[PDB]
Amino acid sequence: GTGQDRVVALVDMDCFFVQVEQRQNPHLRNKPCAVVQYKSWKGGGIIAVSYEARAFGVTRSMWADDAKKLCPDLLLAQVRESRGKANLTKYREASVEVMEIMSRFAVIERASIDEAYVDLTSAVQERLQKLQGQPISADLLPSTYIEGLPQGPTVQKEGMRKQGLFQWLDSLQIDNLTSPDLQLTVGAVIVEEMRAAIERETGFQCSAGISHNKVLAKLACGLNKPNRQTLVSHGSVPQLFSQMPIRKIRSLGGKLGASVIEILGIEYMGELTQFTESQLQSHFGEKNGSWLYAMCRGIEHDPVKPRQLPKTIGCSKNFPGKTALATREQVQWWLLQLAQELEERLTKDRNDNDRVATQLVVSIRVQGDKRLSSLRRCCALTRYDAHKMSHDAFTVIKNCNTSGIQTEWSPPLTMLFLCATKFSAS
Template sequence: MPVARPEPQEPRVIAHLDLDCFYVQVEQRRNPALRGQPTAVVQYNDWKGGGLIAVSYEARKFGVKRSMRGDEAKHVCPGINLVQVPVSRDKADLNVYRSAGSEVVAILSTKGKCERASIDEVYLDLTDAAKEMLSESPPESSEFIFEEATKSNILDLTSDASDREENVKAWLCRADADYQDKLLACGAIIVAQLRVKVLEETQFTCSAGIAHNKMLAKLVSGMHKPAQQTVVPSSSVQDFLASLPVKKMKQLGGKLGSSLQDDLGVETVGDLLGFTEEKLQEYYGVNTGTWLWKTARGISGEEVEDRLLPKSHGCGKTFPGPKALKTNTAVKSWLDKLCEELSERIQSDLNCNKRVAQTLTLHARASKENECNSVKKFPSKSCPLRYGTGKIQEDAMKLFESGLHDFWGYRNTGWSITSLSVTASKIFDIPSGTNSILRYIKGPSSGASSTIVDPSSTPDLTPFVVHEEQCQPSSSIKEDCDNSSLAKQCGATEEKGVSKKLSKAQESGSILKFLSQSQSAFHEKRNFDGLICSNQGHESSSGASEAGQHGKTNINTAGDHSAGNTWMLNVEDIDPDVVGELPLEIQREIQGWIRPSKHASTKKRGSTISSYFSPSRR
């Protein structure tokens, strides 16, 4: 499964940062009384004290471990504080941790390329920053070395003595070091500064690894915890890896690592050196073979991606043992909750980050009632994602039914569902440039009276028909773009004002209208899609009066032109005949959205609009 990537020849400076027992720190910040106390974060307190998902270092001293139950933890550490994960819609709600994680990313992304690797981990490519420091204020000629940096752990540097910090300082400042080590030293200083900054601004401590590639940085970031950093000079790599148990390497913690042990007798990474690349390829295929060969030598060309946001959003829940779901209505009820949360999260992603998700996937685990415990897997199913809670719920249920159908094959014995999850993926940025056609669509803040477009240049689009119920306004965009207030703000999501305005705009003849198909056959995969609309901040209008109309608070129709309101217009289908009547420029744009689909809907042979943000087009 792992794949080797070509090697950059220039030396890089890569850091991996990892928040220490992150969920615990988040809870400790919320309740400072927990600081310095043995503490763990637990979810679902009802059964055996719930499961631990994060454990403070004080509690670890007592032998408390992740994957213990709350009860066991209490047993080995009677004084432990157990904090529950927030629950909403009867499931764990991780949003507080997600947004706390983004706080950290926001700080770390200021220095070089930054990749959000997980909710509490980040990779940085500090090559440029390190080079800059080396040329402008090299440590060797600097009077003062940032103190936190002198607390670094340098692999290979004997570090037990009382003069440890002096040794480290000396290493960081060595004038006779090679270029690579000098870069690493700069990297270590930069990371130390960043960690202090993170602490100051978020109160979170983190640990870090600094090396020439991701693999090594990650490998050592957890070596000295908490709140410490470790540097890997290339001269130390060989010896370090030689004695390292294979299972400690990322990607070798599972079956592949076990296979190395059991089938090849490889216990340490050093043992791997006894195999030629060809031999490893014989066992594990070309890609994995090469990857293993390079890994054994500390070689990894994997780049730090420039990505601050997750690539997908998922919500799930398990229903262990007696809690397994056995009826369609139970499934529906849970699916509805999961979809509600998912809908909120993608809506927030749209508002805050101007991103749209294209695919909805449903996963489930099921077992058959009596009879031979079939090992059959419940198939995962996916379909184009339509925005709007109701639509997501509807589609998810259809996906479930379709999966269930496959699951039984021909004979329906009873089933029970032990886990359910829905995921939104294939997320793309909304192009920020001028979105020509969108100018013909009025946003929530444009009253019918204020016209965005010049009527004379506005084509007559009357043949299109807007279906109001397809209009799905976003919730307020105002703030919340740290999603700390996500749940709160996304609660007020239904808004009638928009459809009203769309109708008004429709009357005025300055709006693009779409033809809708009947809801028919889902199985034939109607190719639905949505259109993102945004009034890029021109025109100021009558917000206050509008805001009064819909009873919900929190709806932000007016103002905030800097952000621009974003909402979703769902489109079921478009009549190709009508497209032909539009101005050529618009036609071309629309053609761009259209991509052929194997499972095109029964109607109107040919294409359906699939997505405005097709990945294939720039």
């Protein structure tokens, strides 16, 4: 097919953790500010950056002391620390605020703490029927960009936006209820309403992409951040993809996308069209090969999954450098700190969402291993009891200690991770 069957939107909050802190603390609003984790080592690690601070070159992962060199007036909000660890509860609860608003408009797939996909196909059909072929006024799309427009025969971005939108709407054929471009346009009208409700009811601004599938919706979202939304039509794909680096497409940002560029000797998504589906399958596998063949034409069939809640609840802490855990008592104490946070999050989850986790995953990283995880083990999660969860976690990992002195722990542990999974309705 032509991959125009659905209307799919991705809504992503703008500098989300910063907005959460700026709502709470109005003295941070409209200023270069960032959210920082910990403090002692180089001022802490930055994990979110306001757009005023991005202009100075402040970025994620940057040390706060280094960010202050680029932006001396940078304001910092620190992530909460509980039981010796970062605690992200404030941001999870703000995320729930947003997701429950989005859910009023259509079923959502929670894709991260700050973004969800929406399938608007049904909602579009209903608005199209409630409207009666009445044209769509530009006033209904006050923050929408039409990628690829304006085009053809002034110098301010808002003026450009309106010129593109006018061109788009002037060419739209509303007599055809099945026109994909009309469907996208109605989808964008709905997303305007959804974004307005989010801002009114939470104070948070967001951006969105509207297209026919997840990949295009995600790409569109980022094209005019912040506080704007972008419609990427099927027709816009050839020009858009002709200069689009492969690594910008969701799932091609790692080794697979590197192999595509390396093996095929290309750089842009549109260059993939010159290969047969079998060719791509030969290099990258049947699944990936078929996916790439469709995707480079703007076609992708990954459905918006109805999932509003995370399906796992985890707690993790790294122990870098000299802080690596080297004694049994140290491992036990931190496993308990993690287990205690997990217990309170699990208890809250059960009351909120009428479900219980049944499996506990335990993962550690050993000193020197660059892998995210060095070993993973599981056991039953029978009761929401921190001491039992930490005791069981130690049982399943205690043989990894290659030390003739049992009071010590070698090799030193550089990460502990506890994750509750396999939820069942309760």
